[PDB]
Write a protein that binds this ligand. Structure first.
Ligand SMILES: CN(C)C(=O)c1ccncc1NC(=O)c1nc(C2CC2)ccc1Nc1cncnc1
Ligand SMILES: [Cl-]
Ligand SMILES: [Mg+2]
Ligand SMILES: [Zn+2]
Length: 313
């Protein structure tokens, strides 16, 4: 009950910032996440004995892949924690509890392959779920872990607060299907420029929470350049692996994934930053002004990639 988590000074300070890196020590990530829940939500809203057991069962079910791993989960959780603590009044007791859990579980059991590769390989999960394949798998794995004995961190919610919270987590996890992000932002832009955006419209929150999730999931691009550049390797190791696996099915992969077309990365980083990231954080700032630091940092990194092209690094 009275068992606060504290962090080393530098961590206690830097964690509150959007561009925080959770560091190379696996064994502190669970404390960091508990710390975030206790500050973001209250010291009460999860039984520690149950949270810690959930966290470790969650960690246990992330695989040792270069990018879509346990560190990515906690990175994305952290970025969501930065948004919640800078938009304190806007979000319900439950929205805070479910979103942080949503972020931690958003990529459960990821194998390091796109929805595309599941379809062209004809993986069972592509048969069981026609769209948002991995994302429906991830939400599925979340419910499995919640139904293990001694793992129901939501135990004390009512029947209806429970279905309210499992439904926040489900749409939140689905929204990390970047194929849905594009429509979701277009509609949110159209509703902010026309002035129809209304955070009391449930279907409107849904979309906003949807985009926060895109923003949190993409937040490796909102870090300091040395973090961003070193993450870019990890995401490209999965990309080139999947390219290798496309070639094995006798399909030439998009160039993003062809490890012969390594020369073309910086241009593809530009393309990504212009098509996805700058828009996401632009629209997210419009809707949630205090999240501007994410846009600012995103822009800085786009600039850093323009210098790579221009042979200045
Ligand atoms: C949709 N579209 C155009 C592209 O997907 C894209 C295209 C050309 N090149 C790269 C692309 N995507 C990425 O680079 C990227 N993608 C994801 C999510 C799986 C989609 C997350 C992060 C990314 N970058 C990054 C860099 N550094 C740190 N973290 C992440
Ligand atoms: Cl606070
Ligand atoms: Mg994912
Ligand atoms: Zn992710």
């Amino acid at each position: 009950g009275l068992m606060q988590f504290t962090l080393p000074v530098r961590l206690c300070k830097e964690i509150e910032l959007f561009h925080f890196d959770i560091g190379p020590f696996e064994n502190m990530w669970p404390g960091i996440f508990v710390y975030m829940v206790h500050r973001s939500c209250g010291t009460s809203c999860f039984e520690l004995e149950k949270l810690c057991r959930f966290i470790m069962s969650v960690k246990k079910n992330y695989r040792r892949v270069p990018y879509h791993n346990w560190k990515h989960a906690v990175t994305v959780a952290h970025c969501m924690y930065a948004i919640l603590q800078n938009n304190h009044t806007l979000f319900t007791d439950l929205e805070r509890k479910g979103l942080l859990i949503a972020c931690l579980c958003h990529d459960l059991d990821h194998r390091g392959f796109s929805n595309s590769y599941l379809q062209k390989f004809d993986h069972p999960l592509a048969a069981l779920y026609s769209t948002s394949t991995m994302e429906q798998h991830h939400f599925s794995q979340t419910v499995s872990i919640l139904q293990l004995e001694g793992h129901n961190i939501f135990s004390t919610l009512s029947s209806s607060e429970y279905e309210q919270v499992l439904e926040i987590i489900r749409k939140a996890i689905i929204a990390t299907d970047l194929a849905l992000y594009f429509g979701n932002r277009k509609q949110l832009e159209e509703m902010y420029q026309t002035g129809s955006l209304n955070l009391n419209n449930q279907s409107h929150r849904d979309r906003v929470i949807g985009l926060m999730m895109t923003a949190c999931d993409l937040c490796s691009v909102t870090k300091l350049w040395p973090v961003t550049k070193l993450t870019a390797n990890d995401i490209y190791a999965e990309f080139w692996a999947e390219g290798d696996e496309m070639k094995k099915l006798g399909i030439q992969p998009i160039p993003m994934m062809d490890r012969d077309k390594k020369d073309e990365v910086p241009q593809g980083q530009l393309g990504f930053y212009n098509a996805v990231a700058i828009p996401c954080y632009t629209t997210l700032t419009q809707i949630l002004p205090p999240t501007e630091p994410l846009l600012k940092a995103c822009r800085d990194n786009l600039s850093q990639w323009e210098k790579v092209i221009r042979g200045e690094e």
